[PDB]
Amino acid sequence: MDAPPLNEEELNQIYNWIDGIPLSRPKKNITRDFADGCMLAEVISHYCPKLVEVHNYSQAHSVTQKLYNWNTLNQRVLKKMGFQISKNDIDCIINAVPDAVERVLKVCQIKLDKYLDDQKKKKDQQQYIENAQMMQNGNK
Amino acid sequence: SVQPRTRLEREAMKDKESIEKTRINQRVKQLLHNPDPKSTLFIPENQRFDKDFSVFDKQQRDQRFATKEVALEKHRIEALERESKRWEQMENQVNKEQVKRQF
Amino acid sequence: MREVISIHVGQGGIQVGNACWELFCLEHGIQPDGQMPDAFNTFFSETGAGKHVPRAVFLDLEPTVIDEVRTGTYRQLFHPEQLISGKEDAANNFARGHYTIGKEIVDLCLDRIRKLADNCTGLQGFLVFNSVGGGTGSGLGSLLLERLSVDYGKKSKLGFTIYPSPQVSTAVVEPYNSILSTHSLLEHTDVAVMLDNEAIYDICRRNLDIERPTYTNLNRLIAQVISSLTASLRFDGALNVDITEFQTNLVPYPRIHFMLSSYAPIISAEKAYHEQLSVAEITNSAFEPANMMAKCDPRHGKYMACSMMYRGDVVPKDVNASIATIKTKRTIQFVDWCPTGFKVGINYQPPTVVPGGDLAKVMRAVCMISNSTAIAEVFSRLDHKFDLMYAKRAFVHWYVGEGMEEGEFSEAREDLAALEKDYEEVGIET
Amino acid sequence: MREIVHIQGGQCGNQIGAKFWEVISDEHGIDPTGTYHGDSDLQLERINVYYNEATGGRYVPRAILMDLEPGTMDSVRAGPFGQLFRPDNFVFGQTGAGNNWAKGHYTEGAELIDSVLDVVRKEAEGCDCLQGFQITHSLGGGTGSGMGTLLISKVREEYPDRIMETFSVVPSPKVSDTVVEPYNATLSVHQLVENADECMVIDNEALYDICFRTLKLTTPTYGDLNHLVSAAMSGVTCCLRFPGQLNSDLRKLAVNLIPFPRLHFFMIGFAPLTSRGSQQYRALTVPELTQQMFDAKNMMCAADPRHGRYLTASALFRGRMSTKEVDEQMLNVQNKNSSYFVEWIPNNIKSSICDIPPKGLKMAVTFVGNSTAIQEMFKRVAEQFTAMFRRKAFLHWYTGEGMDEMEFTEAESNMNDLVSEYQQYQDATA
Ligand SMILES: Nc1nc2c(ncn2[C@@H]2O[C@H](COP(=O)(O)OP(=O)(O)OP(=O)(O)O)[C@@H](O)[C@H]2O)c(=O)[nH]1
Ligand SMILES: Nc1nc2c(ncn2[C@@H]2O[C@H](COP(=O)(O)OP(=O)(O)O)[C@@H](O)[C@H]2O)c(=O)[nH]1
Ligand SMILES: [Mg+2]
Hints:
- The structure is cut from a larger assembly and holds chains A, B, C and D.
- By secondary structure, chain A is an all-alpha fold.
- In chain A, 22% of the residues are buried.
- Chain A has helices at 8-19, 30-33, 38-47, 63-76, 87-94, 100-139.
- Chain B has helices spanning 7-10, 18-26, 53-102.
- Chain B has three helices and no strands.
- The longest helix of chain B has 50 residues, at 53-102.
- Chain C has a ten-stranded mixed beta sheet, with helices on both faces.
- Chain C has helices at 10-27, 64-69, 96-100, 103-117, 135-151, 174-186, 197-208, 215-230, 269-272, 279-286, 316-328, 376-390, 397-400, 408-426; strands spanning 3-9, 44-46, 52-54, 56-60, 83-85, 123-131, 156-162, 191-194, 258-264, 303-312, 342-347, 364-372.
- Chain C has two domains: 3-258, 3-Layer(aba) Sandwich (Rossmann fold); 259-377, CATH 3.30.1330.20.
- Chain C is globular, with a radius of gyration of 21 Å.
- The longest helix of chain C has 19 residues, at 408-426.
- At the C-D interface, helix 2, helix 7 and helix 12 of C face helix 10, helix 12 and strand 11 of D.
- The structure holds guanosine-5'-triphosphate, guanosine-5'-diphosphate and magnesium ion.
- Guanosine-5'-diphosphate binds next to helix 1, helix 5 and helix 8 of chain D.
- Chain C: Its EC number is 3.6.5.-.
- Chain C: The active site is at residue 245.
């Protein structure tokens, strides 16, 4: 995902957004603290608890386990939100390359807001259909 | 343990030029079916038919373990020998000091 | 007055049958000649004076393995005319062993099955072994299961199938016949146990410390699992379990009966006795994801029900004290609609050791049969492998020309999609 | 059971067979007088695959030798192991073809072939269960490339369900010994694709390159090339004559290596091959075998296998070895070379293990891989054919015996279509 580098204002917005979320562990270095994919799973679970099984993502120092966590998150969660992270971007994140996680967090934020709006519209439409069917059965 | 003998044993050195002298002194192929007996590849024709990796591996595995066990006992003994000499030498030093004092 | 009949078809099936039949003969004291120098009745039958005959039948179209069996040390044990052999191999073609050459052999096998069944009076059920990634194995297993399901009806049949590994494979066409055989046994077998080779290779490497294993080492572990499963029928125990007491405890719904197994402890005599092998540590090792007998991660899914067998000098209170600890852990979570999910069995006979083998002699052991939601990954990856080649219709001409119709591939794909949807539908909380 | 008969034609095929049968007899311990003098029991269990039994206890090969001139068979009889062949199977004409394809396929080869077909029918009708036929012939000669290919069609018309093998030597442009090689090569390739179930191309240039570079012997002769070809030929059917962990007959290879019915042109190679002076340095291990097996210079064809992508591959290991190592090495050779393996068919390497190694060697491997790099040979053959045909050079010799230029045009068009549709799958993506 060749996303442009984030400006300082966009970085501050992402950090404030992430600090508004009650995560299981205090943040000290976002680039390192997200490198295992566990904190991104918690961030998504806060808004979409039925979408993410956080227990499938164990805290990880090894490259192999970080890569497993990220591939699992990318296939099971992010794909359902209508985006996927590239292998190269995953490799940048697990190595704590600067700006790599912040770009992914920005894309995740935008995709999460859109996903929540689409879930709300589906509920409102389903409730309208259920109410319309109840009014037809009352006449029968 | 670096070591040398007495002065008499070396006996070459009182202004020796022998070392200089020594420098002066110097002035349809069928090899597929016929691998050499020495080589690893050669399996005897008579034994060509044991067909079990299982039994063979178990005996081989047992042997591979055993060499390591004897090796461990030997290397540890060498470790013990440096330490024993040092312990002995410190004790020896005390005896020796004692010996000179008595002399 | 309780009996069971084991069916061995294909090269892998026969090679694991040999492995289990050294172990049973050793465990009941019967010499390889069949002569003893009342628990034998489950697997054997008395001939009136002397030898015992196994309640097993060996099937294969390719004669090499049967000929090897009929000349080894066990030539005197098996009845000469229950080792049914063909002439022409199916050659990894599923359509061959289901439509062309298996039909002419299946009648003799069914006659042998009838002749063995009329002798039994308390027949508990059938056991069947077959490596799935082969022509004759999968095809004949499918045909035999389909014939037995209508000849006998409600009798229970158990299948110890060996699915291909995620990435390691010996053939190139095994996804096709694996998918077709899964289609066939989905609606025809009561229990199916996962047995892929890669997980057992890792088990041997990590625990047994063997760097060059062969198939015999794998088959011995499978034989030990079978013996642990069937010990409760032929030995006295404080908490017995029968074969018929499974679909009431491990199978929530008729479609879902694929589960994966594990065994503990697995350790060599060189370092076994240095540690005490308490029941708590063995029951912890049995639940470790790395000790699954199939290469699947249980951390990726929920548990549905766990049936786990002990044998040796284990005391029930120690078992309960260890089930509580497992319920405590946060990394193992059960499905919402199942408050208790454990079925426990305790037997007194310790596992028997085979001379020259890998495993050592121990007084306690545990074998677990666990049904979990995480099994859908193997179906998904096999489906992905199948789709890649079915997109271009590769290797299909080898199947269409053996009597199979073109549309038969699609409906197996639809049934796998249905199974994957069902596994997702069950695992969601209410 | 499941045995095959041997049929050879032409001088090159006769010389190949004269060493193939010597190698087989030495493997089974049969003296040149037809008397068994072997050491192991397994040497006699499956001898019915290639040898028949006659009164007096001696064995006779079921080989059929045909040529349009009597010299080569009158010479092979005086060589070692020449007495094994039954005198009745020798059929020959009095005229010869003179490297003219038309004479060996229309005028002279048509009248003679009835007698050889009579003995072929006698041999096939009698045998217990037929597996198939294997054919050795050269595409650079007239009588061979004509009569052999017409015999292929005649055999296929009568036994449509059996399997057919052909080991074909194609004329390379580097070492050319006949000026009319392109004509009878192009005409033969047209008929060979329509009837042969399997085809294995062998080039004299690649054999000279191997002998000069790997064995490093000073003066290669036809005896060394024949010995290498014979070892490669024997390696394919080894597990059909000996027990093993995973038996795999010819039909199983046919299922797993041919994705589409018209793509059945393989190139092979044999390992290990070491010089006399370095046979003591090397240590025989599975990694050492597999690194030489996939080596580009080790292929029996001048085609460069890193100029294309493998559709599938096969390996037939010999000797007693662990299967886990074989599978992991096959996986490793496929992960490190993902660029040279087609991506829409996963797990495209087949492996097999036979517990009986060659006499004198502890481990051996035979490699059969279906690759897209074979297009280069047909490209150069067609290039020479169209360079020579545009001037109608040497055309009158062929047209004076009832043949016309239309059959040349159709052959060229079909060969070019084969070349195109063989590479069509090289650029195919999922
Ligand atoms: N666990 C285990 N698996 C085996 C063994 N032998 C073969 N297999 C598996 O079986 C698969 C192929 O089927 P096979 O059993 O070898 O052959 P088959 O079932 O008789 O089918 P055919 O090829 O038609 O003869 C391979 O992919 C192997 O993984 C074995 O001894 N142990
Ligand atoms: N390997 C091998 N190849 C040979 C031998 N003799 C001839 N050839 C090849 O066969 C080709 C000629 O074929 P030819 O003898 O005319 O076949 P024929 O027309 O059927 O008799 C030459 O290009 C040679 O490379 C041999 O003894 N061994
Ligand atoms: Mg088989």
